[PDB]
DNA sequence: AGGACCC
DNA sequence: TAGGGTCCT
């Protein structure tokens, strides 16, 4: 059975949130800085050659008038990220988050419901909303085309709601599985949407210039695949199944080979409430294990306010570190009476004991709360 | 714990 | 070269 999936992906999300706070940043090229990294920038800045994730130096050298704002505190972006998801959940309850500014929504049931409500004459006036990938011709007698055009109409409505209710612009992609939705959502940026009819699936997949660009294939699998002389999507498409299982295991092998064909049966899962709460900090160095205790107290402070607000309780805590010049973690359950909520001083002895069990009394420190209930 | 992947 | 997240072995 075919599906209609939508992938919603916001424009320069952190930048966009900062530009709604202080409008004085509109019309100015804008980057959001975290330590020595420009994590994202507005499209005014991408015109000037600034790119996502280039360090501050490279960015000021390329754009000396670039405005930098600090984005080390995710509180505002996180609040907005969930307003967006909750809005999308109004359309269909089953919404899958991916990072802070992407959502998958399975529009299938919605699409069929709207067609059940259309009169025959009304069914030939069905029009696309936005771009059709590869400028492909629509065949109104093709049931799949009709369903994907309705999918595109719902997408437009979503985007219109996010601008009208939260003042946010973004892109959307409508396709038949999650993978295709997310590959097509990027074809026209910013603030536009694109629909992929089936005939054009191979065109879209082959539009990629290397397997790294396929969601599901990262730095490890990519580098592994290169060692086998697989560099294009068609290489992976035509590569030998058996040989691929042996180097990657039947799992990674079969899933990514199907991906290379545009085929993706994975369902849109309901993300619901977060599975974990964490904060972290990086620095030049921290060999003051008494000072590390101060940093840990600061991290833990905010997390308490956040986890409290959620209304569920974590039954496990974790501490994470990174050694000089490759991360390590140590966890433990959370004492039952401690869950009953001065909870700091208790937690600080726990985390420090976890600290010392990991290090003998320094470039990162992180606290995670998981096992929520 | 760690590792892979994602944004 | 940041600050987050998911799920699997
Ligand atoms: C990929 C990535 C994103 N982010 C944050 C910054 C981004 O604003 C936000 C969403 O990431 P993206 O959707 O990848 O990028 P974007 O929305 O900023 O840019 P685009 O307009 O091209 O879609 O998440 C990081 O902090 N680190 C990362 O490595
Ligand atoms: Cl499968
Ligand atoms: Mg985005």
Bound molecules: thymidine-5'-triphosphate, chloride ion, magnesium ion
- What is the CATH class name of the largest domain? Alpha Beta
Structural class: alpha+beta
Q: What is the multimeric organization of the chains shown?
A: monomer
Quote the distance from N terminus to C terminus.
Answer: 36 Å
Radius of gyration (Å): 24 Å
Placed side by side, the strands forming the largest sheet appear as 6-7-1-9-10-8
Q: Could you state the order of secondary-structure elements as H and E?
A: EHEEHEHEHEEHHEHEHEHHHHEHEEHHE
User: How much helicity do the residues have?
Assistant: 40-55%
Q: What portion of residues belong to β-strands? A: 15-25%
Q: Do you know the CATH architecture of the largest domain? A: 2-Layer Sandwich
Shape: globular
Count of alpha/pi helices: 15
Largest sheet, in brief, is: 6 strands, mixed
Instruction: Provide the domain count.
Output: 4
CATH superfamily of the largest domain: Reverse transcriptase/Diguanylate cyclase domain
How many runs of DSSP E, i.e. beta strands? 14
CATH topology of the largest domain: Alpha-Beta Plaits
């Amino acid at each position: 059975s075919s599906r209609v999936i939508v992938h919603v992906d916001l424009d320069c999300f952190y930048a966009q949130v900062e530009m709604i706070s202080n409008p004085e940043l509109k019309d100015k090229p804008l980057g959001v800085q975290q330590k020595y990294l420009v994590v994202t920038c507005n499209y005014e800045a991408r015109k000037l050659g600034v790119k996502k994730l280039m360090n501050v130096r490279d960015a000021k050298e390329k754009c000396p008038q670039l405005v930098l704002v600090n984005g080390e505190d995710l509180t505002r972006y996180r609040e907005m990220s969930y307003k967006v998801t909750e809005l999308l959940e109004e359309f269909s309850p089953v919404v899958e988050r991916l990072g802070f500014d992407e959502n998958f929504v399975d529009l299938t049931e919605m699409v069929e419901k709207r067609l059940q409500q259309l009169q025959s004459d009304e069914l030939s006036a069905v029009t696309v909303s936005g771009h059709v990938y590869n400028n492909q011709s629509i065949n109104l007698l093709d049931v799949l085309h009709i369903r994907l055009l309705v999918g595109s109409q719902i997408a437009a409505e979503m985007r219109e709601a996010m601008y009208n209710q939260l003042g946010l612009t973004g892109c959307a992609g409508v396709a038949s599985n999650k993978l295709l939705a997310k590959l097509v959502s990027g074809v026209f940026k910013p603030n536009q949407q694109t629909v992929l009819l089936p005939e054009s699936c191979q065109h879209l997949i082959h539009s990629l210039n290397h397997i790294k660009e396929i969601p599901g294939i990262g730095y490890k699998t990519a580098k592994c695949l290169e060692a086998l002389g697989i560099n294009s999507v068609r290489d992976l498409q035509t590569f030998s199944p058996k040989i691929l299982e042996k180097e990657l295991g039947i799992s990674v092998a079969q899933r990514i080979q199907k991906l290379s064909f545009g085929e993706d049966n994975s369902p849109v899962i309901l993300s619901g409430p977060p599975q974990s709460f964490s904060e972290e900090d990086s620095f030049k160095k921290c060999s003051s294990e008494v000072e590390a205790k101060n940093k840990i107290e600061e991290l833990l402070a905010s997390l308490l306010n956040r986890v409290c607000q959620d209304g569920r309780k974590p039954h496990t805590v974790r501490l994470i570190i990174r050694r000089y010049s490759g991360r390590e973690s140590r966890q433990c359950p959370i004492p039952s009476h401690v869950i009953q909520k001065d909870v700091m001083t208790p937690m600080v002895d726990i985390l420090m004991k976890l600290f010392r069990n990991m290090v003998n009394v320094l470039t990162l420190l992180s606290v995670c709360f998981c096992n929520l209930k």
